[PDB]
Scaffold this motif. Structure first.
Motif, short mmCIF file in Angstrom:
data_model
loop_
_atom_site.label_atom_id
_atom_site.label_comp_id
_atom_site.label_asym_id
_atom_site.label_seq_id
_atom_site.Cartn_x
_atom_site.Cartn_y
_atom_site.Cartn_z
N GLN B 33 0.84 -1.22 0.00
CA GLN B 33 0.00 0.00 0.00
C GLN B 33 0.87 1.25 0.00
O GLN B 33 0.41 2.33 -0.48
N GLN B 34 2.10 1.17 0.47
CA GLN B 34 3.07 2.29 0.39
C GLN B 34 3.75 2.38 -0.97
O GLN B 34 4.65 3.25 -1.13
N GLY B 35 3.49 1.43 -1.86
CA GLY B 35 4.18 1.42 -3.16
C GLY B 35 5.49 0.69 -3.14
O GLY B 35 6.30 0.87 -4.06
N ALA B 36 5.83 -0.04 -2.07
CA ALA B 36 7.05 -0.85 -2.06
C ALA B 36 6.85 -2.06 -2.97
O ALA B 36 5.70 -2.54 -3.18
N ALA B 50 -3.47 -15.97 -3.21
CA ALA B 50 -4.70 -15.16 -3.04
C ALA B 50 -4.34 -13.78 -2.50
O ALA B 50 -4.90 -12.78 -2.96
N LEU B 51 -3.41 -13.71 -1.55
CA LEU B 51 -3.02 -12.41 -0.97
C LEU B 51 -2.42 -11.52 -2.06
O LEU B 51 -2.79 -10.33 -2.13
N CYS B 52 -1.53 -12.08 -2.86
CA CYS B 52 -0.86 -11.30 -3.94
C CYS B 52 -1.91 -10.77 -4.93
O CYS B 52 -1.85 -9.63 -5.31
N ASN B 53 -2.87 -11.63 -5.29
CA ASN B 53 -3.93 -11.22 -6.26
C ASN B 53 -4.76 -10.10 -5.64
O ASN B 53 -5.08 -9.10 -6.35
N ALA B 57 -5.29 -6.31 -7.09
CA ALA B 57 -6.69 -5.88 -7.37
C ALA B 57 -7.00 -4.56 -6.69
O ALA B 57 -7.83 -3.78 -7.19
N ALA B 58 -6.37 -4.30 -5.55
CA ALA B 58 -6.60 -3.08 -4.76
C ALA B 58 -5.77 -1.92 -5.31
O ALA B 58 -5.89 -0.80 -4.77
#
Ligand code: NAD
Ligand code: NAD
Ligand code: NAD
Ligand code: NAD
Lengths: 254, 254, 254, 254
Positions: B33-36, B50-53, B57-58
């Motif tokens: 979410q910080q762009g890292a 699933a987490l990566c997808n 998606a977000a």
């Protein structure tokens, strides 16, 4: 100097790891001078046999030495069981043995890391496992586990050693909770820079002397006997409600 | 709630152990979410993919997942090198992975003890070894190593886990000294009782709820996102002169 | 060089002791940069007025300064009540003010001891007393109390100062328990040797520069802004479940 | 039940604050049993006179009692000087006196705060000031300062007491550095919840009995004599290189 007598240690059965040289040897001698029945393991056969002879010559109960490499857990647990067969159930366990060989992050192999933990961390757990049923039969006991100021000082030059030395606090505190219902006390002892022959020979230089003088609050040598006195206190009835805690004997460094 | 932005984390390369579920997954999400540019290892393939997808998606950079058993040091170090080939040198390492399976002193075998240390203690050291040359090429970096309130609370029922969790402080502090000349910061993060799905499913009962309410100063759930915020702080330029220290995020327990 | 934004701090009411110079001035500036409404007390009138003008010129909400000698508890509590009348109930309290004047055991009079405690220890308690009813009305808040590495170092030459600096941990931890039910967080921040103008000009010499280099793990100056970033974190929603704990910002000294 | 003898304590001059009741009375008795020459101050005249007679009836050197309100620093320092005139220079100082009266943040007046600090914090400093020149003449000495697990527990209901109890660590550590060149050791002793008559009668209820059982690792009463044994150790030659450190005697609570 006029040092304490602990009548509660007379006749107690005491097992020590790494008791042949260094701080271990001072702890063996201190307990034998109290009349305790000591047993210890070491790999330094000549020094260990000489220590046992010298203590007997001085009028104390001869400690039982067994040669055992602490990296060999099955051999070590068999040795403890054999010594329990000779002396009876142990009252006191001192997890002293270590090895502070320096090493650099970038050079540590898998095998070297494993060996560092096999020497410095694993034996303590299996020593506890080997003595606790006897301590329950004796109605309680005291376990003393050695840490180091190294991790407190963020000491460089041996990160697997600092890792293992910090780990002692988690072994102590988890076990204090698990064993306290059986009247088994578990404490950490944390030496400062103790002037053993090993430290003087390998690691002490002019810069190290200047670091001792700057960082110790009390000038002069921290010696094996200073650490031995703290271990005797923690094994004696005088400390019956000490558990889970860290006892730092370091001349004021950390 | 209106959470911080850390502009210094945009574009940074971040490696996380155990990033597929639990606190690890919250740290993966927070950094993305910080762009890292995040990479992580886990054995939980379905949850990790699933987490990566979900993060992509977000609207965030898709983290790179690699399946790797952290017990296999050669495979783990090869995985880190392969991910460095994809993302470039890492700026940030988060040593998160652990396993808090309960166990009794009297039942622990040699093999079980070794496996506990292979999961909970050994991977952190080899992760550091794998990333430090890249962090030197990047002009510095930040390493965050996870401890636990378990050893602070003298928690019972898992003495090899408390041992490994205390060991983190010695890994942090030895490395802080060794790596500080390269502008590499090394800190410990110590969660309280975090309400992950695992904790709720396996270890939380009515008695555990009463212990949380008695011991926390702040009522309510300590959550993965609370820990993630502390890790982002310690990775960002905002914390450039924090090193060697322990950051406890525990709602006031210990 | 690209520092965090904490959206949760915009519009928050923040009170700081000793905010006119040194670390306090950096904290005042950092909060104003986040859009908080700051008020602070100090005895350094010209420096405090200048700082408020500089912050206003940078485009941020202009802090409210009041001259107040923190040794005068009634005057101090009246000043906080008057500033609450201007800004509304406070969300955040930062207990920063201190004075590190050196002094020798053998020379300390009763009057000097009382004055040292009146400056370094007593104001924090009465600051909390003055802000807590407003924080309850606001639905919670965050209190940051400053300690020092001095007591952690066993620092010589100012035993009443080390006394007062250690006392902060007991203020923090007793109040974390008492105020946690109101969602008020209470934490300790412990700086290393921060290169304020006052430290450089009063206490720094070539020996002190060598002590900083030997003892810090990270080379270079620990600066007021480093401490300010930790205080912002502890005041923002990102740290909502941090309480009772010590956050050490010291470049690895202790 | 067979407690230690410390031959190095025979003939030593020992001064104790608050020695008439509770833990102080156990410390007075324990030193007298070792053949030390004890002097102590208290406000509890009848209990203090009775204790001195009981010790004399047991065959030990009769302690010297003086009534003194420790809030009156000039009177207290005059009392120490008069007792030095009777016994000679002191070897050992035990800063034991305290008062744990409960109090709420919102109800504490300026006068109450000052009185709490006058009882719990200020006497220790002026006790050290009064004994140090004699300890230098004796070639060294040992100072034992009492803290409390209260601040370690984040104990509620007495924030000025937790403040004063944490402050002990800063007094100890600043003075360990300042006095170490004179061979004067300075250590902190931190009791758990000790079952003195005052604790049982003021503060103990059925909930408190359950809290003791949940939190102690060792079951059963922590007693004044347990604390006394730790203070004897820290005053005897056996602890000659202990300084600056905290010795926690708490049956595993914190
Ligand atoms: N000496 C110090 O300055 C110092 C400082 C802090 C901590 N400590 C701790 O104090 C304890 C004792 O330290 P020391 O300085 O006497 O250590 P040392 O290395 O001088 O002695 C350790 C002893 O254990 C034995 N030992 C080592 N490996 C063994 C193995 N595989 N099997 C059997 N025996 C083995 C050695 O032969 C030796 O007799 C350790 O836990 C150490 O970490 C020492
Ligand atoms: N959850 C808590 O209450 C709590 C409390 C204190 C400390 N901690 C610490 O926080 C960190 C994260 O804890 P958590 O609760 O999310 O743990 P967890 O067990 O819930 O998650 C650990 C993650 O690591 C992975 N992992 C485990 N073994 C692995 C292996 N061999 N190879 C690869 N991946 C493996 C798991 O699959 C999982 O995704 C740990 O260091 C833990 O000790 C957690
Ligand atoms: N600077 C360091 O190296 C360092 C190290 C560790 C701890 N700390 C802690 O950080 C905090 C800030 O330190 P600093 O170095 O900026 O201190 P400082 O002495 O430079 O500044 C303190 C501020 O408080 C004000 N102040 C002092 N006495 C006052 C009084 N009676 N009434 C009103 N205001 C008063 C001063 O005028 C000044 O602006 C303190 O709590 C200090 O103990 C600082
Ligand atoms: N009892 C516990 O559970 C406990 C727990 C942790 C810490 N401690 C610490 O241990 C020490 C002894 O505790 P205790 O429980 O025996 O305390 P206590 O209050 O029972 O006894 C303190 C003694 O000091 C004396 N005293 C109090 N105010 C005085 C004054 N103004 N002038 C002269 N004498 C005065 C009292 O009369 C009494 O004999 C204290 O420092 C306390 O903070 C005790």
């Amino acid at each position: 100097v006029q040092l304490a007598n602990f009548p509660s240690l007379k006749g107690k059965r005491v097992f020590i790891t790494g008791g042949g040289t260094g701080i271990g040897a001072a702890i063996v001698e201190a307990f034998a001078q109290q009349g305790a029945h000591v047993a210890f393991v070491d790999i330094a056969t000549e020094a260990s046999e000489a220590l046992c002879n010298d203590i007997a010559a001085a009028g104390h109960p001869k400690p039982l030495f067994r040669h055992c490499d602490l990296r060999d857990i099955p051999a070590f647990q068999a040795t403890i069981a054999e010594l329990q067969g000779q002396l009876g159930d142990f009252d006191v366990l001192v997890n002293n043995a270590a090895n502070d060989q320096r090493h650099k992050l970038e050079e540590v192999t898998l095998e070297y890391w494993n060996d560092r933990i096999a020497i410095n961390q694993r034996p303590s757990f299996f020593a506890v496992q080997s003595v606790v049923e006897g301590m329950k039969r004796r109605g309680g006991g005291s376990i003393i586990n050695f840490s180091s100021i190294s991790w407190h000082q963020s000491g460089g030059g041996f990160p697997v050693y600092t890792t293992a030395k910090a780990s002692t606090l988690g072994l102590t505190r988890g076990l204090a909770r698990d064993l306290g219902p059986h009247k088994i006390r578990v404490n950490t002892v944390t030496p400062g820079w103790v002037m053993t022959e090993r430290q003087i020979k390998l690691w002490l230089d002019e810069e190290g002397k200047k670091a001792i003088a700057r960082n110790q609050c009390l000038q002069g040598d921290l010696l094996p006997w200073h650490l031995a006195r703290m271990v005797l206190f923690l094994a004696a009835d005088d400390s019956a409600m000490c558990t889970a805690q860290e006892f730092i004997v370091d001349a004021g460094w950390v």
